């Protein structure tokens, strides 16, 4: 089922859209987004794939509990930051892990 | 000319946090191209430039019916494969 670690803070991605509108505008708003995300434990049924499907997942759930104090721009650019953290914190992890 | 075609690259498999696209990626990933192309590496080259021109011209390219979904995984597609093609050209200008 559950349990998940936030991992340690990041640099937000820089990240480059073919839409001028999204490029701009993730450059000017990429700070509203999370620098960290959740994540399931690295364990021996770990691999890229379902390690950054899972962290997707609850990372992008847990942050529209969060922000309970769209629009569909932002849920793009969000899911794209998200992935792509998701991608360094794997890095760390596996790295870690060995 | 004066764009470079990219060989063949794995297809990433990419994330999305709809549960409804995150499947469909899955299931038709086969659909949308393997190979970007773009500006060869220079003195001028940045990631920015770089991965901005790849996007540019792969999507045309392709543009010479498909639904909204398709047009969305296809852009998106091609926004992810023209970093792996930046990384792969860097490293190569060393």
């Known amino acids: 089922l559950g349990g998940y670690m936030l991992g340690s803070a ?15 505008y ?3 708003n990429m700070h509203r987004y999370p620098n960290q995300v959740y994540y399931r434990p ?5 691999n890229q794939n379902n390690f950054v ?3 997707v997942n609850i990372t ?3 942050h529209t509990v969060t922000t309970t104090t ?3 721009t932002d849920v793009k650019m969000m899911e794209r930051v998200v992935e792509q953290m998701c991608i360094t914190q794997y890095e760390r992890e596996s790295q870690a892990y060995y």
């Open 10 to 24: 990041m640099s937000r991605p820089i990240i480059h859209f073919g839409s001028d509108y999204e490029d701009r």
């Open 53 to 55: 499907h899972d962290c």
């Open 26 to 28: 993730y450059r000017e």
């Open 60 to 62: 992008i759930k847990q």
């Open 70 to 72: 769209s629009t569909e």
């Open 42 to 46: 690295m364990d021996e049924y770990s």
